[PDB]
Amino acid sequence: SVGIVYGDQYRQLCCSSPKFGDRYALVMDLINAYKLIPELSRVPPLQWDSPSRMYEAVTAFHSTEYVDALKKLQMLHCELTADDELLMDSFSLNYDCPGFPSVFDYSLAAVQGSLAAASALICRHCEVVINWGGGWHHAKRSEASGFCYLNDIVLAIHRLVSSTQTRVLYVDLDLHHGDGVEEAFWYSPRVVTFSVHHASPGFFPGTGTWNIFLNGAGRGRFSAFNLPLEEGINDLDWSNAIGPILDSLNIVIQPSYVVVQCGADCLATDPHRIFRLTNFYPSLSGYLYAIKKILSWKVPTLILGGGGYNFPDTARLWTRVTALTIEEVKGKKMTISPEIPEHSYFSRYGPDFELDIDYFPHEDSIQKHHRRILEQLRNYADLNKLIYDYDQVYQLYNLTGMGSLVPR
Amino acid sequence: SVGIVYGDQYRQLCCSSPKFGDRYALVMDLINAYKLIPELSRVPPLQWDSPSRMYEAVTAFHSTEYVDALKKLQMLHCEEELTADDELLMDSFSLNYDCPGFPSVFDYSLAAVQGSLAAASALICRHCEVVINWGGGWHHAKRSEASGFCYLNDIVLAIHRLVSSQTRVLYVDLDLHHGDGVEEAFWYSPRVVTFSVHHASPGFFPGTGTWNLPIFLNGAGRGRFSAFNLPLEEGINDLDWSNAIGPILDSLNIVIQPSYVVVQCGADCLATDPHRIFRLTNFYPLSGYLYAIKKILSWKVPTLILGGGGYNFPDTARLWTRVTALTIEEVKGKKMTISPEIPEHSYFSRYGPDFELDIDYFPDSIQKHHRRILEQLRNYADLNKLIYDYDQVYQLY
Amino acid sequence: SVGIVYGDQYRQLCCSSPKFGDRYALVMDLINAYKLIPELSRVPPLQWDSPSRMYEAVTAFHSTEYVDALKKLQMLHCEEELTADDELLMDSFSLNYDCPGFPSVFDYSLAAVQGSLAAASALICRHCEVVINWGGGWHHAKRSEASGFCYLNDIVLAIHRLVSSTQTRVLYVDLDLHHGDGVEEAFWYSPRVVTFSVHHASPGFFPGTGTWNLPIFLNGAGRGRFSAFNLPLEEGINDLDWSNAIGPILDSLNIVIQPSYVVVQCGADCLATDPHRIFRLTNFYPSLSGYLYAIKKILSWKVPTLILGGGGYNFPDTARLWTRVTALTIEEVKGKKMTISPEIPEHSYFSRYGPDFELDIDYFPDSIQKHHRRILEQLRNYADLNKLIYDYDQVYQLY
Amino acid sequence: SVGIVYGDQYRQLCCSSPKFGDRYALVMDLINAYKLIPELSRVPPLQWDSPSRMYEAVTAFHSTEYVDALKKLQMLHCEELTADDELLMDSFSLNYDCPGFPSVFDYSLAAVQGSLAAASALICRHCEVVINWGGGWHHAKRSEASGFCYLNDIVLAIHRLVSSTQTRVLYVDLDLHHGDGVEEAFWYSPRVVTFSVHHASPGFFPGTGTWNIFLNGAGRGRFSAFNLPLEEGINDLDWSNAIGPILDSLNIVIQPSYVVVQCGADCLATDPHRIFRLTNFYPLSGYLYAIKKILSWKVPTLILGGGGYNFPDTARLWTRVTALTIEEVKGKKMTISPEIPEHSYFSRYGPDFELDIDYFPHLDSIQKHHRRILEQLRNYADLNKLIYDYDQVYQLYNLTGMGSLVPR
Numbered sequence A: 001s002v003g004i005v006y007g008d009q010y011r012q013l014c015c016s017s018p019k020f021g022d023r024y025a026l027v028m029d030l031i032n033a034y035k036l037i038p039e040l041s042r043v044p045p046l047q048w049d050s051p052s053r054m055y056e057a058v059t060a061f062h063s064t065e066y067v068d069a070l071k072k073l074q075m076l077h078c079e080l081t082a083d084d085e086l087l088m089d090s091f092s093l094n095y096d097c098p099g100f101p102s103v104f105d106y107s108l109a110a111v112q113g114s115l116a117a118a119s120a121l122i123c124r125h126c127e128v129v130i131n132w133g134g135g136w137h138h139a140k141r142s143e144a145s146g147f148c149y150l151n152d153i154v155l156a157i158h159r160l161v162s163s164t165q166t167r168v169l170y171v172d173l174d175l176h177h178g179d180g181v182e183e184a185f186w187y188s189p190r191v192v193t194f195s196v197h198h199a200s201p202g203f204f205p206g207t208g209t210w211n212i213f214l215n216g217a218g219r220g221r222f223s224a225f226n227l228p229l230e231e232g233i234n235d236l237d238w239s240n241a242i243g244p245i246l247d248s249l250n251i252v253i254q255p256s257y258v259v260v261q262c263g264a265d266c267l268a269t270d271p272h273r274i275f276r277l278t279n280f281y282p283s284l285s286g287y288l289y290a291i292k293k294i295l296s297w298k299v300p301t302l303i304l305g306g307g308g309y310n311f312p313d314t315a316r317l318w319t320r321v322t323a324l325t326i327e328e329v330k331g332k333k334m335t336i337s338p339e340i341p342e343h344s345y346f347s348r349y350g351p352d353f354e355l356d357i358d359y360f361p362h363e364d365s366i367q368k369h370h371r372r373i374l375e376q377l378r379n380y381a382d383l384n385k386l387i388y389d390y391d392q393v394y395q396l397y398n399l400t401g402m403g404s405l406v407p408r
Numbered sequence B: 001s002v003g004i005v006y007g008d009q010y011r012q013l014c015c016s017s018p019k020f021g022d023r024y025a026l027v028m029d030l031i032n033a034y035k036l037i038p039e040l041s042r043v044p045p046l047q048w049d050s051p052s053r054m055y056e057a058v059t060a061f062h063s064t065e066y067v068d069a070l071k072k073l074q075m076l077h078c079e080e081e082l083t084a085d086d087e088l089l090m091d092s093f094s095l096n097y098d099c100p101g102f103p104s105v106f107d108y109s110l111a112a113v114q115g116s117l118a119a120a121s122a123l124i125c126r127h128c129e130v131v132i133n134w135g136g137g138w139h140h141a142k143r144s145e146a147s148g149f150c151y152l153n154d155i156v157l158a159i160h161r162l163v164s165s166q167t168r169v170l171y172v173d174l175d176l177h178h179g180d181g182v183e184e185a186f187w188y189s190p191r192v193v194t195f196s197v198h199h200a201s202p203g204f205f206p207g208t209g210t211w212n213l214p215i216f217l218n219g220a221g222r223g224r225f226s227a228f229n230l231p232l233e234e235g236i237n238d239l240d241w242s243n244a245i246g247p248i249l250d251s252l253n254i255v256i257q258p259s260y261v262v263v264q265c266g267a268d269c270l271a272t273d274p275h276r277i278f279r280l281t282n283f284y285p286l287s288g289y290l291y292a293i294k295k296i297l298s299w300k301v302p303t304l305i306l307g308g309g310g311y312n313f314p315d316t317a318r319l320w321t322r323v324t325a326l327t328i329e330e331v332k333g334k335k336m337t338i339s340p341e342i343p344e345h346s347y348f349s350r351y352g353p354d355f356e357l358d359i360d361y362f363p364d365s366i367q368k369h370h371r372r373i374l375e376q377l378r379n380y381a382d383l384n385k386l387i388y389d390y391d392q393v394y395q396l397y
Numbered sequence C: 001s002v003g004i005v006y007g008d009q010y011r012q013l014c015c016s017s018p019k020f021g022d023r024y025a026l027v028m029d030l031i032n033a034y035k036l037i038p039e040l041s042r043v044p045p046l047q048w049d050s051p052s053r054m055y056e057a058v059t060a061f062h063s064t065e066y067v068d069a070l071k072k073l074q075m076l077h078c079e080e081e082l083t084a085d086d087e088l089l090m091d092s093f094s095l096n097y098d099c100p101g102f103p104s105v106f107d108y109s110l111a112a113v114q115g116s117l118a119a120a121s122a123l124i125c126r127h128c129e130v131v132i133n134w135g136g137g138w139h140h141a142k143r144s145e146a147s148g149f150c151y152l153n154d155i156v157l158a159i160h161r162l163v164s165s166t167q168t169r170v171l172y173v174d175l176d177l178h179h180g181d182g183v184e185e186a187f188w189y190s191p192r193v194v195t196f197s198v199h200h201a202s203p204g205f206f207p208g209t210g211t212w213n214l215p216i217f218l219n220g221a222g223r224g225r226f227s228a229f230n231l232p233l234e235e236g237i238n239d240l241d242w243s244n245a246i247g248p249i250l251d252s253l254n255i256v257i258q259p260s261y262v263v264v265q266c267g268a269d270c271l272a273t274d275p276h277r278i279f280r281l282t283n284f285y286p287s288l289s290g291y292l293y294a295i296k297k298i299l300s301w302k303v304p305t306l307i308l309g310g311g312g313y314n315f316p317d318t319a320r321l322w323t324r325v326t327a328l329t330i331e332e333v334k335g336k337k338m339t340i341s342p343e344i345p346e347h348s349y350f351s352r353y354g355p356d357f358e359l360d361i362d363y364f365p366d367s368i369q370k371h372h373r374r375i376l377e378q379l380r381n382y383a384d385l386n387k388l389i390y391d392y393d394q395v396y397q398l399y
Numbered sequence D: 001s002v003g004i005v006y007g008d009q010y011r012q013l014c015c016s017s018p019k020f021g022d023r024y025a026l027v028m029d030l031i032n033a034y035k036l037i038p039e040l041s042r043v044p045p046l047q048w049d050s051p052s053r054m055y056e057a058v059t060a061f062h063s064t065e066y067v068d069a070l071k072k073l074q075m076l077h078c079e080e081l082t083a084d085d086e087l088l089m090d091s092f093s094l095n096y097d098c099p100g101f102p103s104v105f106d107y108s109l110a111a112v113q114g115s116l117a118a119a120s121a122l123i124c125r126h127c128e129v130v131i132n133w134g135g136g137w138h139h140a141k142r143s144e145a146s147g148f149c150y151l152n153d154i155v156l157a158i159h160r161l162v163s164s165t166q167t168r169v170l171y172v173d174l175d176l177h178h179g180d181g182v183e184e185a186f187w188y189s190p191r192v193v194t195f196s197v198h199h200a201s202p203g204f205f206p207g208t209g210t211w212n213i214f215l216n217g218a219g220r221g222r223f224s225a226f227n228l229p230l231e232e233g234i235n236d237l238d239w240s241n242a243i244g245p246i247l248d249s250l251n252i253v254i255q256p257s258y259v260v261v262q263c264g265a266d267c268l269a270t271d272p273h274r275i276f277r278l279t280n281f282y283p284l285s286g287y288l289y290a291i292k293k294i295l296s297w298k299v300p301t302l303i304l305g306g307g308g309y310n311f312p313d314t315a316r317l318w319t320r321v322t323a324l325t326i327e328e329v330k331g332k333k334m335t336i337s338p339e340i341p342e343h344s345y346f347s348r349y350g351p352d353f354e355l356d357i358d359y360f361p362h363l364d365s366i367q368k369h370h371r372r373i374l375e376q377l378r379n380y381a382d383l384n385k386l387i388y389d390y391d392q393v394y395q396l397y398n399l400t401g402m403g404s405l406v407p408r
C-alpha cells in the first residue's frame, strides 16, 4: 500500500507560510488532477491527546526552551518587547525564519504529517508513505534554520529507529546539505545519513564538504556520508554519481527503513539555477532514477518534500515521483498525460500547460569521491561488526568498469 | 538593540588563519565569560543562494579575476607545490609574502565579508541600533590586491551596502595602521567620508595617510576633501590620543551628519601590543578606544563596530570585551558590572600572569593638523553645499 | 518585397579576406549589371550602439574568450610577428592553418554577422518576405573555434534571433558541398531548429561529419533528438539526381515541421566548374540547376526565407549562379517575370567572365532510396517526440 | 554679438521627431530659465521666396531624386505605401534608422533653415558666434539618410560660408560618432578642413573615421580630412589633453576664416550610449575646455548640436556651453546657479534638480596619433602652399613636454 499524507486542515496549515505560499496545494491538486489520489491510502496527520503529549513528542529532539519560544512567537504575531526580541534572536527566530501568525501551527503540522507517515510504516499499513508537506532538514535542536522551524525528519526517524538491529538509511536529495538531520544523528550508528548537494564558499548552509571529511563521531564515526557536487550537473551525471553509492549503502547497511528527502530545488528551472535536473520520464530524471532505485530494494520507505521554489515545476516533479511510487510498489502502470489536466490551478502551468518542465538539456568526474565514500562505508562496517560484502559491491561498480574503486 | 556577529562555522573559519590563530575565540569566549552574550542580538553571517550571487556581492568592490585567483589559491593549498605559472598569477595579486595562501584562505576571507554584510543589513532593516563584528575590519585589502593580511575588504563592502540602501557614511579607523584600502575605495565618493588616525613614519606599513613643501592628498573628483587623516608619532598615550581625535570626531559628526557610522577598532594601539608603538590602554575608571567609542555612540547614529589588528590576543580580547560592555551600556542604558578578575573559562590560562581585566601596563604638531583638518572640513562642506555652524565647529578646538 | 544586404563599407569588408578576395564584388556587380537591384530592397548591415552591445550580440553563441582572441588576432596582424604565448592562445581557438589571421579578420567576420542579423530583422518585422545575403552563410564556425574559413557563425546568430522573436520553428537548409557542422552542432539540443544538410561525405573529406558515425546516424540529443537531418552523397552527382535526392525530403520537412522561417545556405561549391570538382550541378535554367530547383521549391512554400551564400571558389561561376538565384527569388516573390540575357552584360568585371562571356557556366553535362527510408523514419520519430500532427501516407506519397 | 537660432514654428518643428522628442524645447527653456536669452541675439531661421528657391538651396548638396523622395515620404505619412514607393524609400535608406513620419521633411528642412541663417549672420558680420541647438546632423549623405540625419544642415552651412567673400573653414566634430557625412561631402576640397574625434570600434556606427593607414581626402583634398578615434571610457581631462593641442595646431596652420563646431552631447557619461565619460562640470568638462579654446582664437564660429539622448543632461551641457560663449565673446561674467531654475520643464531634472550631471568621475595614451596628425597637417600645408610654422607648433606641444612629436 502506498500512503500519502493529506488533510483539509493540514492543507490549510501547510499553505499558511509566507515563504512557501500555496505550493503544497499545487502539488496535491496536480496529483489529484492526474487521478492518482484513488490509488493512494490517505495517511491522516498525527494528533495528540493533550498539550503535554504534544510537547513530549516535539521535545524528543528539540529543546523545551526552543519550543516555548516558538509558541510565544506565534502568540505574539497573533496580536515585541526588548526582551522578546533577544529571546527570539537567541533561537534564530528572525531573518530567514521570522514569525508569522501561524508559525508554530505551520511547523507542528509537518511534524504531525511525518510522524503519522512513520507510524503507518511501522504497523505495516503502507509499504511507502509520501509527505509533500514535510522534509524540513535544516532545523536544529534549539535553532530555526533555512525556513525550517521544527525538524520533522529527525522526529520521524527517531520514531522508526526506536520501533521494533534496526537501522535507518536517510537519503537527502535536496540541493542543500541536510545539516540538521546529519547533526542530530552524528553520534548514532543506527541512523546512517547520506546527503548529495551543492557546496561552495558562501553557499547555504556551509557544511557537507571538506573541513578531509568529518563523518560522525563516537559510536557514530563513519555514519554520516556526504557528496558535494559542483554546479551545472545534469540528470545523467547526477544519476551516475549517486546510483552506485545508494546500492552500496543498501548492500552494506541493510536498512530496515529508508527516509528520502526529495527537495526539488535541483531542477534546472528552480530559481536557484545551480543543478540542471529535470522531471523527464521516457534521458531520465535524476530524481526518478534515484527514487526508482531506492524503491527496488523493497525496504519500507518514507518520501518527504523539502526545497523547491518554482511551485508549478515542483508540483510537476512530485506528481511524477508519486506516479512512479505507485508503479514500483503496486506493480500498476501509471500513464500520465503530457498535458496538464483541467483543475483550479491549471492557469499556473502556463504558457505551455505541459507536464515536462520547460527546459532544454544540453552540454569533472568524482571517482575519488566514490573511492572515499566506499572506504568510509568499509570503516562503518568494521566499526559496527557488519558484513562488508566486497564481492557484491565490487560486482556492482564493475557494471560500469569501476570495480577498482572498491576496497577489500 | 545591540547586535553581534557570531556562529559555530563562523568561529571555526575566523580561527583558521595562521596569523590571527584562535584570537576570535578568545574574544568571544571572554565576552561570553563576562555574561554579555544574553544582552546581545546574535547576527548570523550572510549566506548566498548561489555561486553567482556570492560573486555578485564580492565583485561589487573586488575584480572578478582577483576573486578567481583567491579561490584558486584555496584549492591549491588543499591538494599540494604551485607551478611557475600559478606563482606568477598569485604574485600579480600580491597573494604572497605577507598574504600567503593557506588551506581555507578563501573561506576565511569570505567569512569576514559574510559577517559585516549581515551587520550592515541588521542596521538597514533597523533590527539593531549597533552591530559588532569582531571577526571583521580588514581595511588594507584593495580591488585587485591582498595587503596587510587582508584578502577581502569586508568594510568597503559593508559601507557600499549602507550607501546603496541621501545616505552619507562616516568611516572612523582607529587601527594603529592607516586604513588605506577603505580610503582608496571611496577616494572619488563624497557620500562616504573616511577618517583614519594612525602611526605614520618612513618605512612603516603601509606608508600612506600622511604628507605626500608636500601636502595631504584628500580625495579627488567630487570626492575632494572627503578623506581625512591624522598621523601621530610613536609613544602617544590615552589622554593625548583622545584629545587629538576628540574635536575631529565631534566636528565630523556636526558637519557630515552621517546616516551611519562605521568604526574600525583595531587593538594594535595598545601599549602591550607587540608593535609597541602607541600606549593606549583598555582602562575604564581612560582608554583612548573607550573614549572614542563612547563619543561616537553618544551621537545615536546607527553604527557598525569592527575589529582589525591586535596581536596580543588576550589584551585584544580584554579591550574588545570592554568595548562590547560599553556599547551595551550606551545603547540600552543598562549598567554593566564587569569583575576586575578574569572569570574561569576555556581560555582562562592565557590571561596570565595576574588574570586582571586591565592590561598589564603602567602609564603642537597636533595643533597644526587640527587647523589643517578644520580647513579641509570647511572645504568639504563648502564643495558639498552643507550646513555648518562654523561658530560651533571652531569651539571644539 | 525581396531584400538584399549591401553597403559600401560592407562590400569593402567582404572583399578583405585572402581566401575569397573580391568574389562578393563580382556577385553584386553581376546582379547590378543585370538590372536586378532596382527590384530589391536594400537591407543595411546591423550596427551597434556600443562595444558591449556588439559583444552581447556575438556572445549569444560564441564564447567571450574566443571573441577576445579573434579581436586580439586582428590587432596583432595590424602591426608589424606573434609571441610564443599568443601563438598558443590562437592555436587553442584554431585561429591557424585553414583560418589564419589577417589585417581585418575580425571586421570581415563581423560584417557577415552584421548583414545576416539585419536580414533576420527585416523578416521578423515583415519588411521583406525574403532576404538575400551573399556576404553570409559561414556554417563551419563553432562556439570557440574557427573552422573551414569560417570565423564567426553568422547563420547560427541569425537563426537564434529568428527563434528568439515572438512556437516559432526554423528550418535550416544547407545546400553547400560541405556538411554544415557548425549550425547543426549549435542546435543539436533544440527541437525548434531543424537542420538539414545535403553534402558530399567520404573518408578524409572536410569536415568529416554529416554521415555514418554497424554504425548509424547521430541526429540530435536531449529534446533535440531526431532534429538534425543529413543526406551525404557520392561524388559525381548531377543536377537531376541531386534534385530528386533532395526534393522529397524538403517537401516533407515543410509539411511536417511547418516552419515559421526558412534559412538556406546556398554554397556554390557543388558547381561542376568549382575547383573542388566533386558534384556536377549547374546554374542552368531551361537539365535544370539543382540549386534553382531547390530554391524554387522552398520559395513555393510562401514562408519568410533567408538566403545566404557560403562556399564557392570559382568566383565568376559563383556570381553566375547567385545572379540567377536572385532573379528567381524576385520572380517567385513579386510575380514579376525577370528576363536575363544569356550573355554577360558589360560592367567593370566583364573581363572575368571569359572566354565565352555567357551566363551559363561552361560545362557539357538505391543508396538514396535507403537514405530516403532512413530520413522518413527520422521525420516520423521527430514528429512523435514533438507531438506534431501530420498524415502518414501523404508524407510517404512524395516518394 | 552672440546669436542663437530660435523661433516659435522652429521650436515646434525641431520637437516634431519621434527620435528626439522635445529635446530642443528642454534645451532652449533651460537656457531661457537661466536668463541667458536677453544676452543673445535671436537669429531667425531662413525662409525662401518660392519652392524653387528652397529646392535650389537644398540641392546645392543633396540630389534632386533624394529630396523628391523625402518630400514624397512626408506626403505619404500625411495620408500604406505601394510596393514601389517602398522600394523608392529603401533605395534612399528612408527606413529603419530613418523612418518617415508626418513632418519628416519639414523637420529636416528646419535644421537647414537654422544653420543657413546662422551662417548668414556670421557672413554679414551681425554675429561673431551663432549657436543652433536644432542643427548638427552630420550623418546625412548626398542621396541617403543616415543615423536619423535626413538633410545635412552642416554641409549646407559650411558651403554657404566657404563661398562667401583664401577663405578656409575648419570643421570640428566633437560628437561621440564619426562625422562621416560632413567629411565625405568635402573629401575633395582643401578649403574645408574636417576634424572628427569620436569613438570607433568593430561594429560601432557608422564604421568610418579609423584605420582602413588613415584615408584623409583625395585629389586636391588630400590630407584635409582629420580623424582621431578614441577607445571607450575616456574622461574629461584625457579627452581634453587629446584634442586641445590638435585644435590649436589646426588653427595655427590652416588659419580658418570660420570655425564650425558640432557639439553632439552623447560623449556625456550619463548618455545611454555609456561609452565616453565627459561631464558638464565647471569650477572641467572636455566640451567646455574645447569650446573655450576654439573661442579664444577669435574666429567667427558656428556652434551646432547633434547627438545626445539623455535630454535633461544634454540641456545641462548646452546651457553651460551657451553661458560660456556669452562669457568668452562679450567678456560678461555669466554666473549660473547650481540649482535648476523654476520653469515648465523643472520636473525633468529630478531627482537632484541641479545643473551638474549626476555622475561621479573615477599606456592608454595616443601620442602616436598626435605625431600622425601633425605629419598630415604638414602634408596638407605643403600641398596647399601654406606656411607651416614649425616653431609655434613646437612651442605649443612643448607646454606639455611633447614638442618632439612635431615634424619639421
Ligand SMILES: O=C(NO)c1cc2c(Cl)cccc2s1
Binding pocket: A096, A138, A145, A146, A147, A174, A176, A204, A263, A265, A306, A307, A308, B049
Ligand atoms: O531550500 C532550502 N533548504 O533545503 C533553502 C533555501 C534558502 C534560501 Cl532561498 C535562502 C536562504 C536560506 C535557504 S535554505
Ligand SMILES: O=C(NO)c1cc2c(Cl)cccc2s1
Binding pocket: A127, A128, A295, A296, A297, A298, A299, A300, A301, A328, A329, A330
Ligand atoms: O512486495 C511488494 N508488493 O507486492 C512491495 C513492497 C515494497 C516495499 Cl516494502 C517498499 C518499496 C517497494 C515495494 S513493492
Ligand SMILES: O=C(NO)c1cc2c(Cl)cccc2s1
Binding pocket: B098, B140, B147, B148, B149, B175, B176, B177, B205, B266, B268, B308, B309, B310
Ligand atoms: O594590523 C595591521 N594593519 O591594520 C598590520 C600589521 C602588519 C605587520 Cl605586523 C606586518 C606587515 C603588514 C601588516 S598590516
Ligand SMILES: O=C(NO)c1cc2c(Cl)cccc2s1
Binding pocket: B129, B130, B297, B298, B299, B300, B301, B302, B303, B330, B331, B332
Ligand atoms: O535611542 C536610543 N536608546 O533609547 C539609542 C539609539 C542609538 C543609535 Cl541609533 C546608535 C548608537 C547608540 C544609540 S542609543
Ligand SMILES: O=C(NO)c1cc2c(Cl)cccc2s1
Binding pocket: C098, C139, C140, C147, C148, C149, C176, C177, C178, C206, C267, C269, C310, C311, C312
Ligand atoms: O567551402 C567550404 N565549406 O562550406 C570549405 C572549403 C575548405 C577547404 Cl578548400 C579546405 C579546408 C576546409 C574547407 S571548408
Ligand SMILES: O=C(NO)c1cc2c(Cl)cccc2s1
Binding pocket: C129, C130, C299, C301, C302, C303, C304, C305, C332, C333
Ligand atoms: O503573401 C505573399 N504575397 O502577397 C507572399 C509571401 C511569400 C513568402 Cl512569406 C515567402 C516567399 C514568397 C512569398 S509571396
Ligand SMILES: O=C(NO)c1cc2c(Cl)cccc2s1
Binding pocket: C049, D097, D138, D139, D146, D147, D148, D175, D177, D205, D264, D266, D306, D307, D308
Ligand atoms: O548621435 C548619433 N550620431 O551623431 C547617432 C546615434 C545612433 C543610434 Cl543610437 C543608432 C543608430 C545610428 C545612430 S547615429
Ligand SMILES: O=C(NO)c1cc2c(Cl)cccc2s1
Binding pocket: D128, D129, D295, D296, D297, D298, D299, D300, D301, D328, D329, D330
Ligand atoms: O573681439 C571680441 N570681443 O570684444 C571677440 C570676437 C570673437 C569672435 Cl569673431 C569669435 C569668437 C569669440 C570672439 S570674442
Ligand SMILES: [K+]
Binding pocket: A172, A173, A174, A175, A176, A177, A178, A195, A196, A197
Ligand atoms: K541534499
Ligand SMILES: [K+]
Binding pocket: A185, A186, A187, A188, A189, A190, A191, A192, A193, A216, A220, A223, A224
Ligand atoms: K549517523
Ligand SMILES: [K+]
Binding pocket: B173, B174, B175, B176, B177, B178, B179, B196, B197, B198
Ligand atoms: K587607523
Ligand SMILES: [K+]
Binding pocket: B186, B187, B188, B189, B190, B191, B192, B193, B194, B219, B223, B226, B227
Ligand atoms: K571619500
Ligand SMILES: [K+]
Binding pocket: C174, C175, C176, C177, C178, C179, C180, C197, C198, C199
Ligand atoms: K551542405
Ligand SMILES: [K+]
Binding pocket: C187, C188, C189, C190, C191, C192, C193, C194, C195, C220, C224, C227, C228
Ligand atoms: K536541431
Ligand SMILES: [K+]
Binding pocket: D173, D174, D175, D176, D177, D178, D179, D196, D197, D198
Ligand atoms: K565626432
Ligand SMILES: [K+]
Binding pocket: D186, D187, D188, D189, D190, D191, D192, D193, D194, D217, D221, D224, D225
Ligand atoms: K576636406
